[PDB]
Amino acid sequence: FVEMVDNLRGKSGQGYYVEMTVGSPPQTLNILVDTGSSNFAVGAAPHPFLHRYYQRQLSSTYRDLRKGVYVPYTQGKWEGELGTDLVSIPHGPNVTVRANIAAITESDKFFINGSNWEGILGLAYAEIARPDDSLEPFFDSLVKQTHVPNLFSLQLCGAASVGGSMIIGGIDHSLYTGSLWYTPIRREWYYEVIIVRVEINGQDLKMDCKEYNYDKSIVDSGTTNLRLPKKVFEAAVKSIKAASSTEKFPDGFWLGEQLVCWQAGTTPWNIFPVISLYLMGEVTNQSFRITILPQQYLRPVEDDCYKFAISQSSTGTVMGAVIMEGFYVVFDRARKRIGFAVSACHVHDEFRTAAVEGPFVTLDMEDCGYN
Numbered sequence: 005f006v007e008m009v010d011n012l013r014g015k016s017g018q019g020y021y022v023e024m025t026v027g028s029p030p031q032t033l034n035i036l037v038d039t040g041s042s043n044f045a046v047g048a049a050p051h052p053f054l055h056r057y058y059q060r061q062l063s064s065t066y067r068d069l070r071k072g073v074y075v076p077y078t079q080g081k082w083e084g085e086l087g088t089d090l091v092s093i094p095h096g097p098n099v100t101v102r103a104n105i106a107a108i109t110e111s112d113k114f115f116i117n118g119s120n121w122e123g124i125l126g127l128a129y130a131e132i133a134r135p136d137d138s139l140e141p142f143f144d145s146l147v148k149q150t151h152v153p154n155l156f157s158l159q160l161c162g163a164a165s166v167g168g169s170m171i172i173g174g175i176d177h178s179l180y181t182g183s184l185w186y187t188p189i190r191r192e193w194y195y196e197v198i199i200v201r202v203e204i205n206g207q208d209l210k211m212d213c214k215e216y217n218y219d220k221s222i223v224d225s226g227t228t229n230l231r232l233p234k235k236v237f238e239a240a241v242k243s244i245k246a247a248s249s250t251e252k253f254p255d256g257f258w259l260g261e262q263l264v265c266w267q268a269g270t271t272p273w274n275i276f277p278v279i280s281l282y283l284m285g286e287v288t289n290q291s292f293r294i295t296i297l298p299q300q301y302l303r304p305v306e307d308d309c310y311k312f313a314i315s316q317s318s319t320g321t322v323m324g325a326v327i328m329e330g331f332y333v334v335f336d337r338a339r340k341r342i343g344f345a346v347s348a349c350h351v352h353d354e355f356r357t358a359a360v361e362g363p364f365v366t367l368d369m370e371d372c373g374y375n
């Protein structure tokens with residue numbers, strides 16, 4: 005799939021975007037790739053932050069669904085009107101499809117000042133599509149209307165100015181080394197998965213594994229951070245603090261409430277512990293583990309100061325860029341599973357490496373799930 009290689013651009017950490025065209029004739033827009041939601045939504049109005057936006061008036065293939073949609077978030081919101089039109093991906097498969105489109109017409113704290121993207125492509129499932137599950141997500145429509153296989157894979161490389169690849173409909177074996185290992189998708193809403201064991205420097209966090217997936221663990225390209233439920237984060241940072249005692253740091257840094265700065269060229273990564281997540285394997289009692297380095301979780305902000313890219317959540321575990329930038333991630337929707345392999349472009353020093361190792365024995369994996 006050379007056509008699709010390197011078809012993602014972005015800034016740290018404003019997320020990854022792919023080029024898309026909408027309407028007849030094609031209107032080109034940068035759209036953020038987001039496996040954490042299910043709406044295909046674009047700016048339709050001249051907000052000051054946007055470089056461009058959907059002009060429905062120019063498109064003869066536009067159909068009004070006469071239905072509004074309101075998406076509130078933690079603070080801030082986006083609001084738009086629903087429609088269908090002809091969507092294509094110039095650096096993707098060679099097809100045009102008719103998809104639902106939310107024309108954004110009011111937002112707060114949604115678009116980023118300085119970013120280069122004008123909408124969002126929700127790659128996840130219908131159950132979490134706003135307003136409700138009848139609003140068929142983009143990917144369900146591609147697969148329903150063409151011969152494109154029901155899967156996609158993501159390689160997000162870790163560096164303003166980041167890049168990557170979204171392979172629609174297949175796997176490019178040149179993008180990863182070693183072997184894929186698959187975790188089943190627990191439920192088709194988000195890409196929800198079960199984490200069965202957490203290590204830091206290969207030392208167990210020894211928590212009831214139900215806590216790791218409370219109320220949810222998901223794989224999510226739209227989130228920058230590794231987000232852990234509070235207990236888990238508490239125990240994880242407590243463990244990281246310990247493992248990294250060669251140098252001390254203010255108590256606010258670990259809450260991500262300030263930055264931490266060193267001289268150019270002088271960062272000591274070895275003070276810092278590898279983080280291992282074990283994920284439910286394909287077979288009963290079988291698991292595998294993924295392993296990230298500090299280069300993934302200590303991420304430089306350029307305005308050398310790094311931010312601690314692991315934070316707490318009440319929404320569950322979120323395996324954001326921090327995790328995904330180490331691995332080639334296959335979203336195998338056809339077989340209800342997600343595959344991980346060591347990415348060919350992942351940021352690594354000469355000592356260590358991101359790893360996908362298996363198999364391991366883990367009992368009661370299904371009990372780590374929340375009900």
Ligand SMILES: CC(C)(C)C#Cc1ccccc1-c1ccc2nc(N)ccc2c1
Binds near residue numbers: 039040225
């Ligand atoms: C992508 C940013 C974080 C800039 C946003 C936003 C936003 C604003 C108002 C209403 C909804 C959202 C929104 C939309 C999609 C999302 N996807 C995710 N994976 C995580 C969070 C998301 C939040």
